[PDB]
Amino acid sequence: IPLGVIHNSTLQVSDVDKLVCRDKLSSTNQLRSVGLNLEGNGVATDVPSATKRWGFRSGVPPKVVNYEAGEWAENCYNLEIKKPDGSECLPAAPDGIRGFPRCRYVHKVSGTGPCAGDFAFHKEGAFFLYDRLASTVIYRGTTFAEGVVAFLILPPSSGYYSTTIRYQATGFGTNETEYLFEVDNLTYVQLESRFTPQFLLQLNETIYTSGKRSNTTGKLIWKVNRKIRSEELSF
Amino acid sequence: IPLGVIHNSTLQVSDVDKLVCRDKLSSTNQLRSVGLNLEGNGVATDVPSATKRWGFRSGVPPKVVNYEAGEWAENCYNLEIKKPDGSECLPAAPDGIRGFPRCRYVHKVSGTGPCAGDFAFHKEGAFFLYDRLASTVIYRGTTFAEGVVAFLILPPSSGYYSTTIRYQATGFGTNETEYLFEVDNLTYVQLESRFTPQFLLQLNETIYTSGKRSNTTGKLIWKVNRKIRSEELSF
Amino acid sequence: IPLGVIHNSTLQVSDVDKLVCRDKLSSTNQLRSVGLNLEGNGVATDVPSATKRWGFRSGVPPKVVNYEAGEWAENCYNLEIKKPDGSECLPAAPDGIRGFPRCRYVHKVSGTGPCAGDFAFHKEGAFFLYDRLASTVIYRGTTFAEGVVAFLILPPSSGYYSTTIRYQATGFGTNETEYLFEVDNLTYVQLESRFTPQFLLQLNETIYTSGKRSNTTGKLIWKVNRKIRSEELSF
Amino acid sequence: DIQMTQSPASLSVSVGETVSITCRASENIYSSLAWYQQKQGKSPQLLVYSATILADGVPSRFSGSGSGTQYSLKINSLQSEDFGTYYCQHFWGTPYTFGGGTKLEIK
Amino acid sequence: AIVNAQPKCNPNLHYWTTQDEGAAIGLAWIPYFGPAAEGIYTEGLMHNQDGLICGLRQLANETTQALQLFLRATTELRTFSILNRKAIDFLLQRWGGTCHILGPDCCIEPHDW
Amino acid sequence: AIVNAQPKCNPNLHYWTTQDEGAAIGLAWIPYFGPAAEGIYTEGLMHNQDGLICGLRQLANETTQALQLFLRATTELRTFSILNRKAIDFLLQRWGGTCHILGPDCCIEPHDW
Amino acid sequence: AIVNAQPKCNPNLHYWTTQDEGAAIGLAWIPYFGPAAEGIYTEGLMHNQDGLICGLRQLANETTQALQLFLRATTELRTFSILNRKAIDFLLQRWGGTCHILGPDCCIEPHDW
Amino acid sequence: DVKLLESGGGLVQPGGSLKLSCAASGFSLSTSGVGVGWFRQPSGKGLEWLALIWWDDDKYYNPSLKSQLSISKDFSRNQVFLKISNVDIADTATYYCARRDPFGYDNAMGYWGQGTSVTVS
Amino acid sequence: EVQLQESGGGLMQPGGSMKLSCVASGFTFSNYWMNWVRQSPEKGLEWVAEIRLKSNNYATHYAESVKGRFTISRDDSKRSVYLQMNTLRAEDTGIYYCTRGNGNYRAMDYWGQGTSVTVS
């Protein structure tokens, strides 16, 4: 495994057959294993694509690795998904696991679907990052921010209190999977694509105000396109 | 973290900007992480003060650290304390935890009180020492001897079978907390202060002999000051 | 702990007071901790002797150690033994434990006996090898191949799908212990000694063919010596 | 105890000829098997270390094969210095066993 | 000496760490008087000077790929360290060779008289 | 420099390892497209050249005996490493002594002019 | 080079360890015939020669304080090692610098002819 | 020669449950392949089968009663047991324990319990 | 190179006893165990006995056709070996050898010149 090297104010690859002393490791505190946010590569954040990126495998056991502190994520996820028969799906997090420190918008999902396999796994192999431990597998509950890790040789409440967007899932891990936004105990809006957290956040302009607000014994789903809100377009 | 260094037959602090070869680490077996007994600093051993030294915090998770073998303790403690509603308080010890090897007088306590928080913690941050693992948190049951740890660079049945003094607690973790000595299924003596383990041990001169010995359907508490024993001064 | 050293194309013992540079550790990937199969020393594989080699101790806690990949075993064992009162005996394997990768003939045993102690232990101290972790203790279920470990400094489905011989135990951990081979829900043959896995395998020449085959409401035991098969010699 | 045999009981040869010797035995999981030769007036000398590893100072011409009940000795070509008789043995542990040997007859 | 993948690099680095040298008060050394479990975090900003941030992302992706196999090869469950091992090989690559001056190693200073 | 115990050495070494350099396809780096959990194993054969295999068994037995005590002395449960520590002492045995040429160390090359 | 805190130092050191070199009998190598789980302990006595024991207590307190923060910074649960890392930095502080004679390092012996 | 001993539950309400047991005071039951079992004779009726238990840890039941019947044992005390869900008047019977008698060929059982009985009310 | 030499051979009357012997140098006895073998034109080479290293508490073995007719001894300070024949019965006329070798090979890699021992 190659290490980044900072020298002549640029990155250099450690994997050479001569280690010239121009780079020196005076102490172990020059070492870093910092995590990086996958999102920083411009990777799409639509929740449907997030689902597309997870493998749903059974077979080989999960592993985790310790890593150095790293960059903030705008988007992160919490998951409650269960199998259609009401079986729990995906293991409870192991001791010492807690959600990532700085997500701006943790997305929370619940609902059921086939939830194939037992250990999930990222289709690209990207790490899930929980606090300071990278993982190859998704844990229940707590937030995982997709990312990668690198190793290099070195020469206020809103920072975590922010978080919006909780929604239901219909099916899971398959092409047929669908999501519906939920506010005020109302399931609504298909969330198909192209919606930033703020795009969705502004939809709360309708909550207890400009629309929706099913003041009935049950909740009504609106199909997103008022045209967008799709008020009274529920079926 | 500084390391002790033995050189010129004296301790020296490792944290210097030049490491002169006069000190040499020929092998890793010169290294030591030995624990030290807090009691060796003359710290009071009265059980009420021991209680005063524990924080009762909830919040940050417990941690432990491996350490080298170390000095004998005259006083150590076992704890069964529970919340007033009968809830268990403080986690069961983790695997591989066992009581300190050489305590002369393990003190055992049981009873209930508010037992605030969930992880206790030492108010001075002193380590709890279980066998070979230092801890920031108190575990149920097994003995922890208060201590600290240091790292330095180096150039018969009674040893564990001894142990006396088991007693009840009234309340816990608060100024109002009180303790009563117990022998022969009798709760007695407030144990307020100034009592060495031997001071208390000699009080067994009354057991089945010179006093107390409530040969009744119940047990009577005596309030310590025969004046000390406070025989028949129970209320 | 001495390390093997390969130099001048021969093994050499690392424990010398001078480390001549003729041996060089250019990287950590020259290091190996490889396991070795005890069976490669000609040690008997009769199941009764395997039982003779296990201590059945209670007392000191189990430990395991990580080790490098190593040689194939012809014989390995799985165990379901329980105490005579129906108590489980021996702990379930810890997480990450799985059976050895290449056993040709895993032997499986079930049944009950006194199963003295709680941690077993090898009488010679030989390691049990589970996957990549050596152990001082037997775990339930999964295969352990007896072996030892060494550390040295360096300068298709049948490979695991093979496996035969499952049998009952009568008593356990004691001189009186006895085993009976089982096929077709029939308990038979004392398996006293001298039987290679193939010696036993050829006995399936009788299954649904040349003998035994108790086509009754129950199964009959035959006492091994057709003379060997001991057909109709059950009592 | 493991029993062993060898064949041909002798082989007539010519110089530079490729030759081999069969040795058979009760099964031996060990590859411990080895070969040696002797000359009249001479103490036996090892030709190959157990299995196929050649004894030190043995010519590259020497070879061998097999495991269990069947194994062999081979020589790529012959030199007059190789006249003698040849053997194989069971060193699997104890008691040791030895082949009746063979004779290197000349054409 | 690497360049960015088709992905789009955000040159900004906004990050957080657990490092906090010293203590504000002596009681802060003590977990009992310590900061809330999330209070350990500190944060800072870096910019893509000399292409370093973007270079870092590409390096990270390559490292991640190499790491994935290594982790498959591990037997330990939580792989708490690696860098320590890397430090060992940093030294091993520089040592145990013969080394006065002639070998291309040990950075021997020029010889004076 | 050791010899075999009365036990009987089988000179053959048939072994398996988890090592597998590289990847067949780029997706093989990914556990999701990775080999079945038993597929990691690879295998090979070695022969007792120069007595090495048999020597190895004896060495292993001695090492096992030494190790048993060390493990008793450990306090950690699963002892995931040792070799790293051994590498450290490999270096410590070679370093921190005075060392120009006169000491019997550092493999200093002969001096040229 | 430190002095004692107002606490009162007991100059005696009475201590126990798990170390026990060798084995009394060959079977003692084996846990099956091994000593009772508490039998591993051995003990000894030391005295405050040159102020060493008392100095040790003060050093320990300071170390404990420094350690408390480090542990807060750790992410691993049981921190089984540290000294190994310290050994690595012992070496790193002595190595990778240029070093013939002119630099203040490597303890080069005086040069003979 | 084994002093097998009958034991069991007392009178129960119909729609109740029953526990039955026996013990082999004359034999350890440690021989492999030992089979013991239960059968019943309501109203002077023939040997209705109930269950089989093997020392080799094998269990069998009469499928008609199996839905409400379970086998248990306690070898340390040479005990065998039955549990019966939904006991009612159709379950009133004499009850017996049994053991292989020729032992090891064709079941050969054979050896019998003292006899007990169960009623409901 | 082993410096081995053999002694105590030659003709003897039947029903006797003798201690056939060897001596060697340049291969320390501390690293090995030794074997005696015998050969005849009528038999070919045959194993006679095994002498274990003191680590095995000097355990010994003999071919079952000769067992109890011979015992062995060794002296690791003298680097000497004894066949200690219990009997000199008959058919003992084959050439005798004593061997040793690397434990990671087998004892065949060293042998004596051999000796003749005969019975009348």
Ligand SMILES: *[C@@H]1O[C@H](CO)[C@@H](O[C@@H]2O[C@H](CO)[C@@H](O[C@@H]3O[C@H](CO[C@H]4O[C@H](CO)[C@@H](O)[C@H](O)[C@@H]4O)[C@@H](O)[C@H](O[C@H]4O[C@H](CO)[C@@H](O)[C@H](O)[C@@H]4O)[C@@H]3O)[C@H](O)[C@H]2NC(C)=O)[C@H](O)[C@H]1NC(C)=O
């Ligand atoms: C390090 O960084 C690099 C980027 O620099 C990452 O590389 C990405 O790798 C993935 C695959 O590993 C690539 O994804 C592939 O994209 C193909 C095209 O998708 C597009 O085209 C469709 C159809 O027109 C559009 O609808 C869509 O919007 C896209 O424009 C897909 O066809 C591929 O899918 C096939 O293979 C995958 C993998 O097996 C299957 O899962 C699919 O079902 C299908 O069979 C595939 O999804 C991606 O384009 C690469 N990007 C770049 C920039 O190179 C690395 O992943 C990263 N390293 C690690 C380890 O994370």
Ligand SMILES: *[C@@H]1O[C@H](CO)[C@@H](O[C@@H]2O[C@H](CO)[C@@H](O[C@@H]3O[C@H](CO[C@H]4O[C@H](CO)[C@@H](O)[C@H](O)[C@@H]4O)[C@@H](O)[C@H](O[C@H]4O[C@H](CO)[C@@H](O)[C@H](O)[C@@H]4O)[C@@H]3O)[C@H](O)[C@H]2NC(C)=O)[C@H](O)[C@H]1NC(C)=O
């Ligand atoms: C490294 O490798 C060496 C071999 O090179 C191993 O050494 C073995 O050590 C064990 C003991 O540790 C030895 O076993 C002993 O054998 C004695 C003889 O058994 C034989 O004799 C009987 C009676 O005639 C025959 O029935 C049987 O077939 C054998 O021929 C036993 O008497 C000994 O038992 C006594 O002590 C043991 C140990 O306490 C008790 O358990 C017994 O109950 C009894 O009290 C004992 O079993 C073995 O012979 C050694 N072999 C060799 C070749 O030296 C090491 O074990 C190995 N290292 C490690 C750590 O595994």
Ligand SMILES: *[C@@H]1O[C@H](CO)[C@@H](O[C@@H]2O[C@H](CO)[C@@H](O[C@@H]3O[C@H](CO[C@H]4O[C@H](CO)[C@@H](O)[C@H](O)[C@@H]4O)[C@@H](O)[C@H](O[C@H]4O[C@H](CO)[C@@H](O)[C@H](O)[C@@H]4O)[C@@H]3O)[C@H](O)[C@H]2NC(C)=O)[C@H](O)[C@H]1NC(C)=O
């Ligand atoms: C390393 O070793 C040093 C000693 O060398 C230890 O230092 C001790 O530190 C503690 C605090 O950390 C000190 O305790 C303080 O004592 C004050 C005085 O108590 C006395 O006075 C009262 C009133 O007259 C008497 O009744 C009593 O008998 C004593 O004589 C207290 O007032 C302090 O309490 C206030 O602060 C603490 C801490 O927040 C609160 O918990 C209290 O509620 C209150 O608010 C305090 O208890 C102690 O005196 C120091 N001793 C020495 C010798 O310096 C270090 O603790 C040690 N390092 C580590 C990490 O353990």
Ligand SMILES: *[C@@H]1O[C@H](CO)[C@@H](O[C@@H]2O[C@H](CO)[C@@H](O[C@@H]3O[C@H](CO)[C@@H](O)[C@H](O[C@H]4O[C@H](CO)[C@@H](O)[C@H](O)[C@@H]4O)[C@@H]3O)[C@H](O)[C@H]2NC(C)=O)[C@H](O)[C@H]1NC(C)=O
């Ligand atoms: C859509 O609009 C509605 C308003 O029409 C909005 O509902 C508002 O939500 C906030 C937050 O829940 C409410 O304010 C809260 O009041 C409670 C009780 O006093 C406080 O405890 C809350 O404080 C906690 O949470 C804060 C925010 O995380 C923290 O900063 C703080 O530390 C506490 O943890 C909070 O102040 C407000 O009363 C309602 N108002 C109405 C009329 O509903 C809703 O949030 C909008 N939808 C979305 C998805 O944003």
Ligand SMILES: *[C@@H]1O[C@H](CO)[C@@H](O[C@@H]2O[C@H](CO)[C@@H](O[C@@H]3O[C@H](CO)[C@@H](O)[C@H](O[C@H]4O[C@H](CO)[C@@H](O)[C@H](O)[C@@H]4O)[C@@H]3O)[C@H](O)[C@H]2NC(C)=O)[C@H](O)[C@H]1NC(C)=O
């Ligand atoms: C106050 O005085 C009373 C006597 O008036 C005293 O009670 C005594 O306690 C001891 C210890 O419990 C008793 O002796 C024990 O007897 C049992 C049964 O034979 C033994 O098993 C005990 O041995 C175990 O414990 C020993 C001590 O730890 C170990 O050394 C040993 O290995 C065993 O583990 C032990 O010998 C004695 O009979 C009573 N006597 C009476 C009359 O009560 C009581 O202990 C005193 N109070 C205190 C708090 O000391």
Ligand SMILES: *[C@@H]1O[C@H](CO)[C@@H](O[C@@H]2O[C@H](CO)[C@@H](O[C@@H]3O[C@H](CO)[C@@H](O)[C@H](O[C@H]4O[C@H](CO)[C@@H](O)[C@H](O)[C@@H]4O)[C@@H]3O)[C@H](O)[C@H]2NC(C)=O)[C@H](O)[C@H]1NC(C)=O
């Ligand atoms: C003694 O002889 C009897 C035959 O008289 C023999 O029984 C045979 O066992 C095999 C294996 O169980 C049977 O073949 C199996 O058929 C099933 C169903 O189609 C397959 O699923 C099995 O395949 C699995 O197992 C294979 C072997 O491990 C794997 O290679 C494969 O990947 C699958 O996991 C298997 O093909 C066969 O039908 C019976 N035949 C009869 C007549 O019983 C018995 O095995 C012999 N006894 C012993 C102990 O060997």
Ligand SMILES: *[C@@H]1O[C@H](CO)[C@@H](O[C@@H]2O[C@H](CO)[C@@H](O)[C@H](O)[C@H]2NC(C)=O)[C@H](O)[C@H]1NC(C)=O
């Ligand atoms: C979800 O996906 C499945 C498969 O991807 C769809 O079923 C396939 O549909 C295609 C045509 O688009 C057929 O050619 C295949 O034979 C079908 N079977 C397969 C490949 O699984 C299904 O229609 C999709 N439905 C939704 C709404 O998601």
Ligand SMILES: *[C@@H]1O[C@H](CO)[C@@H](O[C@@H]2O[C@H](CO)[C@@H](O)[C@H](O)[C@H]2NC(C)=O)[C@H](O)[C@H]1NC(C)=O
């Ligand atoms: C236990 O402590 C509490 C508080 O320490 C006592 O209540 C306080 O008493 C003081 C006077 O001593 C008042 O000034 C405070 O207002 C009270 N409240 C507080 C500060 O909690 C209580 O009296 C004590 N009782 C016993 C017997 O322990």
Ligand SMILES: *[C@@H]1O[C@H](CO)[C@@H](O[C@@H]2O[C@H](CO)[C@@H](O)[C@H](O)[C@H]2NC(C)=O)[C@H](O)[C@H]1NC(C)=O
């Ligand atoms: C199983 O072993 C025990 C003891 O090894 C046997 O009982 C001993 O038998 C010997 C005679 O062989 C007596 O001298 C002892 O007094 C007995 N008690 C002991 C030593 O435990 C028992 O007979 C054996 N039975 C079987 C069949 O395994």
Ligand SMILES: *[C@@H]1O[C@H](CO)[C@@H](O)[C@H](O)[C@H]1NC(C)=O
């Ligand atoms: C939403 O519904 C739940 C029941 O599903 C109810 O407990 C809760 O009070 C509702 N939320 C609000 C804010 O009324």
Ligand SMILES: *[C@@H]1O[C@H](CO)[C@@H](O)[C@H](O)[C@H]1NC(C)=O
């Ligand atoms: C003390 O009381 C308990 C019940 O709380 C009782 O079990 C025990 O026998 C008593 N102790 C003695 C020594 O009588």
Ligand SMILES: *[C@@H]1O[C@H](CO)[C@@H](O)[C@H](O)[C@H]1NC(C)=O
């Ligand atoms: C063997 O017996 C069990 C009951 O113990 C039964 O479930 C199984 O079907 C039997 N095996 C076969 C192959 O008939």
